[PDB]
Amino acid sequence: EVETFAFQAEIAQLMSLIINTFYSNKEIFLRELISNSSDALDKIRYESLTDPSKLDSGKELHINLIPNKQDRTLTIVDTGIGMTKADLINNLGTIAKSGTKAFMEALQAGADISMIGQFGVGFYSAYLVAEKVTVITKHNDDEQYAWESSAGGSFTVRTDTGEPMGRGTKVILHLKEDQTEYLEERRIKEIVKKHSQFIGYPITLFVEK
Ligand SMILES: N#Cc1ccnc(N2CCCCC2)c1
């Protein structure tokens, strides 16, 4: 059973801007997704201080980067707090509406796309390099879900039947045909060292078989 939803008009507009603006510094997508993972890990860590049972779904707090050349995907996995169905459909979009309006105002005033994370909508920088994004996520209070969008104004949510995750989020970037440099180990290593060197959780870059 697959549900299809329309993005808010403002978020659809943000996604088209990211897809259509000429902007060569695409590598910042990875900084933004790792930053989101670090924030989700911070959240479950803080909650566990007053309720240790919140880590019954997994004690390890980490980020994995998994390239796959056969599938042309780059996957960012974290064992953070995860997202509920309400997060995926309503809550994040509500917050993202005001962040988007501020980001667009900043751009017309001379800011550039690399400052997107200051406005809370850094996730959508994934569309700098991905033609489709799939998000698998599991929050302690809800079921495991799969969110998906190729932009175009809509996204889907379904209950995920795949491998159970325990807790956290997997962002699967289906890369554009001309963005396969982000599957190469040396390139990912370079980007992590440049933009994510002080993240306070272990980042493991998997290597391809
Ligand atoms: N602004 C914004 C924002 C921040 C974090 N995550 C999201 N997401 C990704 C999961 C499903 C769609 C919404 C949006």
UniProtKB/Swiss-Prot annotation:
Changing residue 82 to D: Abolishes ATPase activity. It comes from the Eukaryota. ISGylated. It is found in: Nucleus; Cytoplasm; Melanosome; Cell membrane. ATP binds at residues 36, 78, 97, 123. Coiled coil: none annotated. The modification N6-acetyllysine is found at residues 43, 69. Disulfide bonds: none annotated. Residues 1-209 are annotated as: Interaction with NR3C1. Signal peptide: none annotated. Changing residue 32 to A: Strong ATP-binding. Strong interaction with HSF1, HIF1A, ERBB2, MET, KEAP1 and RHOBTB2. No effect on interaction with TSC1. Homodimer. Identified in NR3C1/GCR steroid receptor-chaperone complexes formed at least by NR3C1, HSP90AA1 and a variety of proteins containing TPR repeats such as FKBP4, FKBP5, PPID, PPP5C or STIP1. Forms a complex containing HSP90AA1, TSC1 and TSC2; TSC1 is required to recruit TCS2 to the complex. The closed form interacts (via the middle domain and TPR repeat-binding motif) with co-chaperone TSC1 (via C-terminus). Interacts with TOM34. Interacts with TERT; the interaction, together with PTGES3, is required for correct assembly and stabilization of the TERT holoenzyme complex. (Microbial infection) Interacts with herpes simplex virus 1 protein US11; this interaction inhibits TBK1-induced interferon production. Belongs to the heat shock protein 90 family. The TPR repeat-binding motif mediates interaction with TPR repeat-containing proteins like the co-chaperone STUB1. Molecular chaperone that promotes the maturation, structural maintenance and proper regulation of specific target proteins involved for instance in cell cycle control and signal transduction. Undergoes a functional cycle that is linked to its ATPase activity which is essential for its chaperone activity. This cycle probably induces conformational changes in the client proteins, thereby causing their activation. Interacts dynamically with various co-chaperones that modulate its substrate recognition, ATPase cycle and chaperone function. This is Heat shock protein HSP 90-alpha. It comes from Homo sapiens. The gene is HSP90AA1.
